[PDB]
Every structure is written in C-alpha cells, then in structure tokens.
Chain A
Amino acid sequence: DIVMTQSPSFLSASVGDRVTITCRASQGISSYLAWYQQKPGKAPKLLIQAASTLQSGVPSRFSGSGSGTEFTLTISSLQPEDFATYYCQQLNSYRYTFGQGTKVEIKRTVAAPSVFIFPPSDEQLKSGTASVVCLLNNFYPREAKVQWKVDNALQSGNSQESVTEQDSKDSTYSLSSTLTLSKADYEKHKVYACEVTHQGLSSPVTKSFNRGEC
C-alpha cells in the first residue's frame, strides 16, 4: 500500500517566517492530498484540500502545492496562532492514511539544561521499588539525550521520560526521566548516573550519586 512519510517531526520557526512542511507518498497520488492543523486539546482544522485549494476562510498565509510523490504545505508568514501540529492525509484512498504530523514550535536561542539527579526516597524503598529521577530543566532546543548508567553499565528498557510543552515565558522545555528498579536490583549496585547530551553543552554532563552515601 501507499505509505505517507511526513517530515520533519518537529520544526522551530519564528513569527513572520516562511515555513515548509513536506509529505512524501510511497508512490504517485496525483493531487489527492489534504492538510490539517491541530492545536492542543482542539479538533483538527481543514486547511487545504486537493493539494492546492485553500479551504474557505483559512488565511492567505497557508499555501499548498506539489504533485505526484512530493507535496508541501507552505505558510508564507507565520502568525502567533500558527504554532500547532500539522497533518497530511492521502485522499481518495481505501485506507484514509494520515501522515505522522509536524509540530511547529517557537524558535529561540540555544539554552543548556540544568541537570539534577534524585535517589529513591527511603519511603519508596520500604515498598520494594526504587525510582531514580533525572531532571533536565529549561533547555532549548527539545532534542536531548539521557543515558542512564548503573555501575557504568548503560541502561536501556527500564526508563520512561516526559517533556513539558514550551514554557509560555522563555519558550524552553524541561524533561524528566525515571529509572525504575526493584529494591533488590537497586541494592546490588553503587553508582547511579544520568549522562545528558545537548546542543548547549560542549561535552556531555553527568550527575550521579552513590547508593547509601548522603
């Protein structure tokens, strides 16, 4: 079948910029493409149908074009209300296939994260589980990598993370990463560390603690 690849996943732009979102179909779909705009908590809004027909009422900024296998949505002059997620959709198909979506976010300067690591509390350890939390505070851009290490062994598969939306004041993100172990596993190792790599850091920053030592 026809696979819709939408790029990029995240796009940073400034108010008044010219924005280009790309939707690539795995084979020719003529002009059978639609574009949607969706803001957090709201229903999607139809912008353009048939690849180059701006829906009535949508401001002249939004421009759709492209034919065959490569399609583009163009916002000629981005306004404050245009920071949102955008979706392409294959038209006239049995599958009604959607693209993965492009999130257009507020551009700002680079900011390194402040990194903090938190051991599991004694109260949680009594319950048999140990949650170790790594915090990355007020950074930009959103791309950041958190590597958990336990006695210098790189951990994968036992952590989950969550990112806030862009702060309304300074447009930064914050990230929280939680490493979950059983109390038994937690007590078999000494050094717990999270290593953070980010554009604002000249080298990866590591915060760590030793189990049992204040």
Chain B
Amino acid sequence: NLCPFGEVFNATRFASVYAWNRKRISNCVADYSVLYNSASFSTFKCYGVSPTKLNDLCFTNVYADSFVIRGDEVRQIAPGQTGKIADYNYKLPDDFTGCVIAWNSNNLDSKVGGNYNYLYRLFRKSNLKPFERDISTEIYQAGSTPCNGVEGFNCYFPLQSYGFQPTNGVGYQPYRVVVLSFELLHAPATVCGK
C-alpha cells in the first residue's frame, strides 16, 4: 500500500501551530516523486537527506507534522532558529533529519473580516524542546502576584491570534507547513520508496 501523504498535504483543515498535528506513517511505500516534482511549494528544504535521492531509502518511521504560520515565520522552521514560533510553538533539533515544506495558503486561511481561528503561543517561561507540543491555556504570570486563572495586568492569556486578511503583505499571509521527520532506529524499516 502507498503512504497516505495525500491526507496530510491536501487536508482540508490545518492545525494551529501551538497545537501542531502529527501523522505517524508506517508500513507503506512512499512515492516522494509526488512532492519534489510539484511546482506548488514555495519552501522545500531538506536536512541530512537529499530530496531526489529519497526514493531509495528505508526508514523505521516517518512523521508528518503540519500547522499554519506566517510567511515571515517559515524561516524559523529550521535547525538552530529562534523566535516566537521556534521558541514557543514548534522546535526542530540541531541534528534534524528531514524536510520542511511550505506554501502560501492566503486563498484558504484568510477571511474578509479577518480569520482568527489560527493561534500561536506568545507567552512561555522557557523554550520548547525539539518536537515538544504545548497545548496549555494557563494564564501566564508576567509579574509578582499569582494569577489564579484570572486575566488582567501581568496575567495574560498565553495564546495570540493571527490576523489573516487577504490584504496582508506576503510575509503576513498564512502559510501551510508540513515537516517530514525521518527516523532510523534499531527496528524493522517499514517506510521505503520504489
């Protein structure tokens, strides 16, 4: 059977980056020719692997992580980056082995009055670890007094909304991102190419 990459790339709804979605891909033949022969991607950067030479490799597991961020922020989905997205939403390791794929989705993820269904984490005491997913909504304590789950001064809701409107500049328009992680453990390799 063929790997369900279509379910990830062509999904109707994408996740907010703070609650990024992960699809675990196993026991299937992966046809990567569908991806690198597509003229619909604006970002296609791979680390520790060649895209065209991917059909000749077997891996134990493949992970497909997907979410929506700003075009300004696609540069943060890479090893060794800092910023609100890399620090507090989605973090790649230094030794990352995989591919980061992105494309403009302003036609889908922006509404006339402004789309607010897409959120990102703005406040967090410390940086995320690689592949860490934080979905907490706890009120953030920016000062001395405890918040007790009530908003107010020095007590902020940790998530912020993107303002995706069609009139935004490219760097502020929504982009859908798919991160492929390639994992080679001391187990049977279940994801190969042709």
Contact = CB atoms under 8 A, between A and B. Distances in A.
Are any A and B Cβ atoms less than 8 Å apart in their complex? yes
B72 A30 contact: no
Interface string B152-190: 010000000001110111001000000000000000000
A92 B69 CA distance: 13
Nearest to A32: B163
A2 interface: yes
Contact of B114 (A2, A27, A31): A31
A92 B163 CA distance: 10
A69 B167 contact: yes
Contacts of A30: 114, 163-165, 167-168, 172
A29 interface: yes
A28 interface: yes
Contact of B165 (A56, A67, A92, A94): A67
Nearest to A26: B169
Given A30-B163, A31-B163, A2 B72 contact: no
B72 A29 contact: no
A28 B114 contact: no
Nearest to B165: A30
Contacts of A68: 165, 167-168
Interface residues of B, number: 10
A68 B148 CA distance: 37
Contacts of B163: 30-32
Contacts of B168: 27-30, 68
A contacts with B: majority SS = loop
A55 to B, nearest CB: 11
A32 B163 CA distance: 8
A167 to B, nearest CB: 40
Contacts of B172: 28-30, 32, 92
Contact of A27 (B72, B164, B169): B169
Nearest to B84: A92
A27 B166 CA distance: 11
Interface of B: 72, 114, 153, 163-165, 167-169, 172
Given A2-B169, A32-B172, A94-B72, 6 more contacts: A27-B169, A28-B169, A29-B172, A30-B163, A67-B114, A67-B165
17 contacts: A2-B169, A27-B168, A27-B169, A28-B169, A29-B168, A29-B169, A30-B164, A30-B168, A30-B172, A31-B114, A32-B172, A56-B153, A67-B114, A68-B167, A68-B168, A69-B167, A93-B72
